[PDB]
Structure 1
Amino acid sequence: MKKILIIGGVAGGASAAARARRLSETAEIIMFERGEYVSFANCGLPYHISGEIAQRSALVLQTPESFKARFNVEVRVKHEVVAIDRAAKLVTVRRLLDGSEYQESYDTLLLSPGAAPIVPPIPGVDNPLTHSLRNIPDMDRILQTIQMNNVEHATVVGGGFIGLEMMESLHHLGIKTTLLELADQVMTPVDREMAGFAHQAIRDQGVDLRLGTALSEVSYQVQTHVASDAAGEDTAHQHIKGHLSLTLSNGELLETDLLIMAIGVRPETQLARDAGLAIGELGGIKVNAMMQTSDPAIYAVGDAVEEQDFVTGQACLVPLAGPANRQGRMAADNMFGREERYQGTQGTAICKVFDLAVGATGKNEKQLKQAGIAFEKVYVHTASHASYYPGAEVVSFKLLFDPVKGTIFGAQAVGKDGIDKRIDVMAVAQRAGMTVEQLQHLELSYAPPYGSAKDVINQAAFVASNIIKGDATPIHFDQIDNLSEDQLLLDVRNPGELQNGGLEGAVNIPVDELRDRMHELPKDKEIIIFSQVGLRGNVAYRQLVNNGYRARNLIGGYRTYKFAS
């Protein structure tokens, strides 16, 4: 009978504990959790802060007692593993109640300790008004600062998904919010031009968005004067727990009542390092595809481990919940000798940004250039369902692919509806090894409330495939401000449309007058065409190339261009 010990009681470990019971009734299964709760909804926490999830009870999905009744797993809360001795096959555990210590033997051990927020080397950042969000205790601390310090202004640093969620929650509470990101965009899984849709939605809500901007120093200032109604002062905007004065990277000062640090997480590797397990170059635990560490009796899964990138096969960190649960279930399988292999991580992700969703999978354009992987890109901006039926919303969709083999590299989407669905479709098409030309033949669900005769995905697949076959010749938003003397810029929109914006020096020939007004364009210049989203531009392009012009069409039209600057 195997003695199985599991370190960490959430996404990786609890999922392995439950699976392992279903596999064998004779194994002993002990699960250690340093915190008070197991199987809590980490993803839930910014939504309880805003009150969107009303009930704190909805965040706890299992208990020590439920794990014992259902799965006969001995869960030990407030118990922290403080060392693994590999040779002896024993761990040392501390009872956080009283500081006492004991040892526990294992036959096999799973490490699922996760990742802790990153501590920055910012002077003065450790103080009573600065919090990172990882667990329920971190959440009650934030909530308790909001309450006690009468938070009217808050700053969040980092525009990854934890940050955006916390800016949103704060905003939902009526708190005036500043978000600082050092990068030129929020949400780095999508590229910068895609993130431009999210920037504009963030600023439309009145949020002070400060891209390209770092926190340099934090000054905490204790409140010495307690205003009172008794001394006939106004008490409504006092902050009795103190004040923060922030220095930013350009030396401007920001005054704030609360600071949320959300600049990423790093793998918990201290136990693993102490025990001599291999650590990878990104600083996560190194595991093979069976999820086993450098020691064959020790498995590891989740935010603590490095994963193989599905597209390139290189090491990556992707701290998400889906991979952690499925890994955990798989390590339980391996632990009973099933030899199952984890198939790599695509990085499929989605985040709510007020009314928008921002989603992606696979590799982005920054990642591909950095790895010297040659690619092409397409944009579409296609209604989320048939446009004549109410409630349809534009889906701005990016597809990244090999221009020769049609390999799918990456997809990104942003919009008010139907994003989760387009990212999932792409994630399955990529995992299944579909090329862009095969994507053409997708037969998706269409009725007018839900879809369209040609989906976002079919349209993208035609535009990308046209480029592959040489029936289209692209230029991109970053090329078109840079024209030569043998190129002539042509706006094929209607003239009414140019007052919303356009490109310096364009000649204007609406697409529906072009067949007839074409002799106006000289055949010894490469005609450089754009329309609103690309689509009219494509028709024009084809009319010109069919007549022996050299041409190019601006992919994603003026829309993509507009949001890319």
Structure 2
Amino acid sequence: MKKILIIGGVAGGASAAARARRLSETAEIIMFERGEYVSFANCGLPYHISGEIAQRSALVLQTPESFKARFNVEVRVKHEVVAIDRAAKLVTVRRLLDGSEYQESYDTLLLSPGAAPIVPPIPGVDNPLTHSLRNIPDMDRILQTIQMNNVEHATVVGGGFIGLEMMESLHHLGIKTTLLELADQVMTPVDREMAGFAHQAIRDQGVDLRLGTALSEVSYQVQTHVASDAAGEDTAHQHIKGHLSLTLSNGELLETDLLIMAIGVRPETQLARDAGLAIGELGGIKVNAMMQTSDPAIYAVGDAVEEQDFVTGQACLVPLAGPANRQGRMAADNMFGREERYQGTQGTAICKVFDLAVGATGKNEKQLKQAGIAFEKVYVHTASHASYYPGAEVVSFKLLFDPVKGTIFGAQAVGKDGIDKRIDVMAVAQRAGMTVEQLQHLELSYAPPYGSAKDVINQAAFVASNIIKGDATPIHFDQIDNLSEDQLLLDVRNPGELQNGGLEGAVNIPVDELRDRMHELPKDKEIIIFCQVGLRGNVAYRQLVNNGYRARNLIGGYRTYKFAS
């Protein structure tokens, strides 16, 4: 009978524990968790903060006693593993209740410790008004400061998903908020010009967003003076637990009631470095594709481990829940000798940003420029369903691919509806190895409430494949401010549309009058075309090229240019 020990009782480890029991009734299974709870909803925590998850009880999916009754697994809460002795096959655990220790033997071990929020070397950061959010007790501490310091202004630092969901939760509660990010964008899985849609939705809601900005120093000032109604002062905007004074990278001062630090997570590697297990160059535990670590008796999975990038095959860190549940179930397999291989990670993700969703899968343009992978890019801005049926919303969509083989590198989407469906389709298509050209032949669901005769994805294909075939020639948003004396700029929108914004120096010929009015444009210039989203631009480009003109169409049209600035 195999004695199995599991370190961590959440997404990785709880999922191996239940799987391993279905596989064998004879094994001994013991799962350690240093916290009070197992199988809690990490992803739910900012939503319980704002009240959107009304019921604390809903964040707890399994208990020690339920794991015992259903799966016979002995789960020990408030028990922290403090060492692994590999030659002996024993682990030392500490009982947090009283600080005593004992040892336990294993036949095989699974490490599933996750990743801890990043500590930044900021003077004065460590203080009673400053918190990071990983678990339920972190959430209760945040709640308790909100109540007790009567929070009216708050600052979040970092524009990744945890930061944006804290920001949104704080705003749900009536709190005035400021978000700082050092980058020139929120959410880094999406490129800069796609993040612009998010920046404007965030500023439309009264949030003070400051990009390109760092937090230099934190000054915590204890409240010395308790105002009171018996002294006849105003006690409504009082903060009894103190005040934060922040210095920013540009010497400005920001006064605040609460600071939340959401600048990312680092893998939990201390038990593994202390036992001599291999660490990768990203600082995560190194595992083979069977999820085994340098020691064949020891497995690891989840936030703590490095994975293989699906597109490139290189190491990457991607702390998401999906991969961690399916890795733990596969480790349980392999611990009974199935020899199953995990198939790489795409980084499929999505985040709510007030009324928008922001979604992506595979590689963005920054990661491709930086690894020297040649690529091309397309944008469309296409209704989430038939436009003649109410509630349709613009889906802004980006597609990164190899301009020659048609390989799918990545996809990004942004809008108020149907983004979770476009990113799922592209995730499936890429994982199954489809190329752009094949994307053209997708037969998706169409009735008017749900979709359109040609889907967002079909239109993106045709635009990408037209470039690959040489039936289209592009000019991107970043090239169009910089024209040469051989290029003539041409706006093919209608004249009423021009008061929304255009580009300095365009001649205006509306697409519907172009055929007739053509001789107006000299054939000794490369005509550089744009419309609102790139579609009327394409029509104009075909008429010009069909009559012997040299031409280019701005992909994404003015809408992509305008959100990119």
- Under TM normalisation by the shorter chain, which class is it? over 0.9
Q: CA deviation at 1:154?
A: 0.2
- Which whole-Å CA distance do the structure 2 matches of 1:191 and 1:258 have between them? 30
Per the alignment, in what secondary structure is the counterpart of residue 209 of structure 1? strand
Shift of 1:343: 0.2
Alpha-carbon distance in 1 for matches of 2:371, 2:539: 35
Q: CA deviation at 1:556?
A: 0.2
Residue aligned with 2:516, SS: coil
CA distance in 1 between counterparts of 2:335 and 2:477 reads 52
Question: Which residue in 1 is equivalent to 2:137?
Answer: 137
1:404 Cα deviation from its structure 2 partner: 0.1
Distance in 2 separating the partners of 1:156 and 1:182: 12
What is the CA distance between 1:338 and its match in structure 2? 0.3
Cα displacement (A) at 1:25: 0.5
Q: Secondary structure at the match of 1:516?
A: helix
Deviation at 1:291, TM superposition (A): 0.3
Provide the C-alpha distance between the structure 2 equivalents of 1:427 and 1:201, rounded to a whole number of angstroms.
26
2:425 match: 425
The Cα shift of 1:52 comes to 0.2
3-state DSSP of counterpart to 1:154 = strand
**Pairwise CA distance, 1:479:** 0.3
Shift of 1:521: 0.4
CA distance in structure 2 between the aligned counterparts of 1:272 and 1:498, rounded to whole angstroms: 62
Task: Give the drift of 1:208.
Answer: 0.2
The CA deviation at 1:151 is: 0.1
Residue 85 of structure 1: aligned partner: 85
Q: CA deviation at 1:17?
A: 0.3
CA distance in 2, matches of 1:441, 1:415: 24
Structure 1 partner of 2:413? 413
Q: How far apart, in 2, do the equivalents of 1:137 and 1:466 lie?
A: 54
Q: Distance in 1 between matches of 2:157 and 2:96?
A: 31
Deviation at 1:465, TM superposition (A): 0.2
1:505 equivalent in structure 2? 505
Q: How does 1:250-269 map to 2 (within 5 A)?
A: 250-269=250-269
Q: How far apart are the structure 2 equivalents of 1:298 and 1:555?
A: 51
Are residue 18 (structure 1) and residue 40 (structure 2) matched?
no
Shift of 1:44: 0.1
The 2-side partners of 1:515 and 1:184 are apart by 43
Structure-2 residue corresponding to 1:219: 219
1:490-511 CA distance string (max 9 Å, x none): 0000011110000000000000
CA-to-aligned-CA distance 1:417-453 (integer Å, 9 cap, x gap): 0000000000000000000000000000000000000
Deviation at 1:369, TM superposition (A): 0.2
SS for the counterpart of 1:474 is coil
Match of 2:133, SS state, is: coil
How far does the alpha carbon of each residue in 1:284-335 deviate from its partner, in whole angstroms, 9 at most, with x for none?
0000000000000000000000000000000000000000000000000000
Give ranges in structure 1 of 5+ residues lacking alignment: none
Secondary structure at the counterpart of residue 138 of structure 1: helix
How far off its partner does 1:86 sit?
0.3
The structural deviation recorded for 1:401 is 0.0
In structure 1, C-alpha distance between the alignment counterparts of 2:232 and 2:24, rounded to whole Å: 71
Distance 2:249 2:432 in 1: 45
SS state at 2:303 partner: helix
Shift of 1:18: 0.4
Note the C-alpha offset of 1:360. Answer: 0.0
* CA distance in 1 between partners of 2:153 and 2:78 (Å): 35
CA deviation map 1:511-540 (0-9, x unaligned) = 000000000000010000000000000000
What SS is found at the alignment partner of 2:145? helix
Deviation at 1:276, TM superposition (A): 0.3
What's the secondary structure of 1:124's corresponding residue? coil
Give the 3-state SS of the residue equivalent to 1:392 in structure 2. coil
* Per-residue deviation, 1:361: 0.1
Partner Cα separation in structure 1 for residue 375 and residue 27 of structure 2: 50
Query: CA offset at residue 250 of structure 1?
Result: 0.3
Offset of 1:191 from its aligned partner?
Answer: 0.1
Distance 2:400 2:22 in 1: 41
Report how many aligned residue pairs link the two structures.
Answer: 565
SS at match of 2:515: coil
Deviation at 1:345, TM superposition (A): 0.2
Q: For each residue in 1:520-564, what CA deviation from the matched residue of structure 2 results, as whole angstroms up to 9, or x when unmatched?
A: 000010000000000000000000000000000000000000000
Q: Distance in 1 between matches of 2:25 and 2:546?
A: 72
| Partner SS state of residue 303, structure 1 | coil
Query: How much has 1:16 moved relative to structure 2?
Result: 0.3
Taking the aligned partners of 1:511 and 1:100, their CA distance within structure 2 comes to 80
Per the TM alignment, residue 14 of structure 1 is displaced from its structure 2 partner at its CA by: 0.3
Equivalent residue of 1:490, what SS? strand
Alpha-carbon distance between aligned partners in 2 of 1:547 and 1:401, rounded to the nearest angstrom:
30
Shift of 1:162: 0.1
Residue aligned with 2:405, SS: coil
The whole-number CA distance in structure 1 between the counterparts of 2:170 and 2:245 is: 19
Give runs of aligned pairs for residues 119-198 of structure 1, distance below 5 A.
Answer: 119-198=119-198
> Aligned runs of 1:69-468 on 2, under 5 Å?
69-468=69-468
SS of structure 2 residue aligned to 1:304: coil
1:108-153 CA distances to partner (integer Å, 9 max, x unpaired)?
0000000000000000000000000000000000000000000000
1:189 deviates by 0.1
Give the Å deviation of 1:263: 0.1
Residue of structure 2 equivalent to 1:55:
55
TM-score, normalised by the number of residues in structure 1? 1.00
Q: How far apart are 1:396 and its partner, in Å? A: 0.1
Aligned-partner Cα distance in 2 for 1:531–1:547 = 20
User: d(CA) in 2 for partners of 1:488 and 1:69?
Assistant: 76
**RMSD of aligned C-alpha atoms?**
0.3
Q: Distance in 2 between matches of 1:216 and 1:12?
A: 36
Measure, in 1, the Cα distance between the counterparts of 2:443 and 2:246. Answer: 54
Deviation at 1:262, TM superposition (A): 0.1
For the residue of structure 2 that corresponds to 1:514, the secondary structure is: helix
SS at match of 1:92: strand
How far the C-alpha of 1:90 sits from its partner, in A, is 0.3
Counterpart of 2:391 in 1: which secondary structure?
coil
1:259 positional shift: 0.2
Q: CA deviation at 1:245?
A: 0.2
Give unmatched runs, 5+ long, in structure 2. Answer: none
| Counterpart residue number, 1:64 | 64
How far apart are 1:470 and its partner, in Å? 0.2
Identity of aligned residues (%): 100
